[PDB]
């Protein structure tokens, strides 16, 4: 059997035969013989004498595999590693290394001998290879030392002492041009990141700094530079606390920006339609720093350098800064949005550059801004659209043409419904002309997406184009079933046409879609059975929209579709099959939409769907969050099918159940899965996602989501987790200025309490007791954003409790301190909302606070008034300014309604009227309308002289209300994000009271109201 492969190893004239004999011979070792001494001593002899190194190593590896199953071996190798003869040392170390590579358990008995050996051989003056092998061995030694129950303090100290030597080996390998061993040493430093700190000592920041010096050194070979960039990226994922402690964020960012500024192959960039350059890895480093660190450490340095780089004579620096921003936004979208006053002009400057690489860089930046800040970018369509079209018309490179189309796509998709209509017809004609001219399927795919995005924005305004578009696009979805002979891009073009035709079905509704429903639906049911994961994905996306369009009429298709979806969700995902991951995401969304659009006919599928999804939560690689989200979607469907109307639940702790036993059982199922995926959960994205789902369901259906029958086990578990997140002590945080991801975790943790306060009302006070001091403390954070979240959350909690809140005076006095002393205008703005509410709910004497609070509210008004003077150029400030006007006026109206005779009206009413109508936060109209009803009913002198301004304000309000009603009827199905916020009236009752008021006012002032066209329409 095997011992012949050893004979071949020693003896062939062909060295490549001895080598591959050994490569196979190792494989054989596991699967007896009296004389096994012959094969050891033969191998040891060959390992140290063969002429070529590859044949030496081959014998060495066989010795080791033998080594697992000889008390003299390790002692003899430790002796050989200290031989006077450098080649004998090297081959012994290699064999020791191969032994460590077998993970034999008894190697743990030699930690000290290995530490003492390697402290020596790491600096072997005669063989760089021996130093590199010593570094490589140390990885196994550190792992061995961390298997002790308590890490030996002496091992850690010795091992830490070796770290500077490894750095020397690295410099040695770079100096000597030995890039094979440079790579291996970088693997060693990467392994240091994972180590317990007592093994690595204080070093890690210094390893980062040393890696940065290599990365920016253009004299170093590029592949070594990528290793270095990659190491720092890896340190962001595993050791960000050390990066923060050294405050290296800005140095990392600036180093990466310099590498990305190096020139690149321009013609490749402009034509290649497809990660290992220094320039590309540098962008990935920026991208990861933006996700990992607070924006002061990454985005702020970038925006500081935007002026000088964007004007540089070096086009690669103009290109570099735009691409830097393009990769900043995903990790720091809020900070990026706040810098739009600088960033948008910069993208416009970039589009006007003479160099195409800079123009492409600007386009990539815009695509990235649209993806993350959707409608916020589309507001600038008036500058962008002319520029982007001109680039499409005059493009000389395919990659510019693609990204121009894709930028146009992202803008058009989120254009305001009113504005798209001015563009819709000229746009429609241009995109179909483009579609004809271009024959590349990569380019056609991007044009089809832009067309569908027109439909999405236009809603019912798309009807004139619906039949021509489908006629045309039906050409790209022939022979769906036949995938043999199609390129990946041909598949994408087919898939995108299915997706965007179904999006047109969302724009025009079921009646206008009636012509094509059957052929298109049949075509999509072909897609689902096909062997393209991309094509199946587009089938499910098509079905998801059909569910929105046809509601319960789509139920006859359930028997057919669900079996396909279950099959899609159960597929093996492995070398992670990205196409299957996308398909599963969309199939889960299809299942959710079908469940919410079938109602009673999705009752046979509820239990099987929960079992399939629960299996994915437990076992899937990237579908956990979505699988769990879909489970709550199934619950939402079951609760709606039981005619629990959204927001109509009984408040307070439920002593039993307001839901029938079948529904409660479905709820409890998902409630258990939710809490098991937050308890001890290490991924913050998973925690964020669970908290978001729980808040949403609590908001819609009440406390029955978290508790029933007086048993608060899960409620207390939830609050425990949330409280821990607020304190920074949850498993997902314990692997300052916070990253935005970290800020989201805070926001959604606070929002659990917000939702519970509205669920519980008075009942919440006992739950709130533990979190209340922490939230009051977060209101004082050195971080402005944390203060903004906390003050905002306390105010919503106050709204949740209302007049059943036992802490009004404590909370009132805390928000008054924020209102009075906080340096941030936006924090003071958020506080003024909470202050008015607490006064509205208070039942004790507040006469002592009215005068100081009014003074502070007026100062806040004055700082916002000054900012309002220079903001034709900065919408982030304009939103804060406008929200301050709404909140302060709302709070003042609340104060007057609560205690009119403590507020001197003579100056307050005019200050109120000067900030009406509002531009945002229309919910604050509610106290103001009630105030106007009271002042006019008492014929108050102050408002009576102000009747023109008051009827003028309602003229704006009612015009806005009519636009809102029209926008709602025209819009594309399923765009109900902003529904509550666009409303001018919080209730039909307050709306009708206002109409009667305008009726009276028309009886006085000799028909002042009728004179106005808008109100004449409402008054009659």
Numbering used by the authors: 40 to 70, 76 to 113, 120 to 324, 331 to 630, 657 to 817, 829 to 1113
Paper quotes:
The crystal structure of full length Kl Kap123 was determined using the single-wavelength anomalous diffraction (SAD) method and refined at 2.35 Å resolution with a crystallographic R value of 20.99% and a free R value of 23.49%. Crystals contain two copies of full-length Kl Kap123 per asymmetric unit. The first HEAT repeat (residues 1–39), an intra-loop of repeat 8 (residues 325–329), repeat 15 (residues 631–656) and repeat 18 (residues 818–828) are disordered in the final structure. The overall architecture of Kl Kap123 is similar to other known karyopherin structures, excepting repeat 23. The unique extra-long helix of repeat 23 is conserved in budding yeasts, such as Saccharomyces cerevisiae and K. lactis, and establishes an intra-molecular interaction with repeats 12–14 using electrostatic and hydrogen bond interactions. This interaction may further stabilize the superhelical architecture of Kl Kap123. However, the dynamic behavior of Kap123 is thought to be restricted owing to intramolecular interactions between repeats 12 and 14 and the extended helix of the repeat 23. This extended helix restricts the distance in-between two lysine-binding pockets.
Kap123, the most abundant karyopherin in budding yeast, functions as a primary transporter for the H3:H4/Asf1 complex, whereas Kap121 acts as a secondary transporter. We identify that there are two spatially separated lysine-binding pockets within Kap123 that specifically interact with H3- and H4-NLSs.
